Amino acid sequence: INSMVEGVLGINESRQIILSNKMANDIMDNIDEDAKAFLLRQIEDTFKSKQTEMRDLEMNTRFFVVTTSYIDKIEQGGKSGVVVTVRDMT
Amino acid sequence: AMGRDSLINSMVEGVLGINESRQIILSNKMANDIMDNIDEDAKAFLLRQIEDTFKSKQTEMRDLEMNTRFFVVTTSYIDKIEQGGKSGVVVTVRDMTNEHNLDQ
């Protein structure tokens, strides 16, 4: 876990997390409710747009670039979803 | 006319999920397109980056040319990518040729 590791989450149509790495777990435990709501909004937009959304989530003293991409194809445990990647730019 | 999306340039990254068995367990259409059109050397470079990520267990970023276009590939390690317990790598591929304006 470093600012050089990206946070990754996979989320299915049911809004269940079906995969995550340590860095995503860490990011989620260390961000506030406003940032979480911003993230949720971006995820919801990606389900709708069905394309890639890329947004800055500027914190106080921290700066993340959040990418969310729509996935139509999942082997087991999902039909569709969104893959979230979070890069700490600071 | 003007609509809700007039100011949006519709961008798409390629996404692949790969388990311990080196099987693709998830993908989007753009990644499918990449894979259907990829040369053998580019495929080996992609595979190599994935292999390096299984080893490093952190995020790798590399430039990859495919059919003259400039891609940036990011690969990140996932300790448990599926419910059965396999680790994996999430691959995201960004088209930088599309980012640029040289085709105008």
From Swiss-Prot, chain A:
It is found in: Cell membrane. Coiled coil: none annotated. It comes from the Bacteria. Disulfide bonds: none annotated. It comes from Staphylococcus aureus. The gene is srrB. This is Sensor protein SrrB. The chain holds residues 262 to 351 of 583 of the full protein. Induction: Activated by SrrA. Expression is maximal during the postexponential phase of growth, particularly under microaerobic conditions. Member of the two-component regulatory system SrrA/SrrB, which is involved in the global regulation of staphylococcal virulence factors in response to environmental oxygen levels as well as biofilm formation. Also plays an essential role in host-derived nitric oxide resistance by regulating hmp/flavohemoglobin, an enzyme that detoxifies nitric oxide by converting it to nitrate. Functions as a sensor protein kinase which is autophosphorylated at a histidine residue and transfers its phosphate group to SrrA.
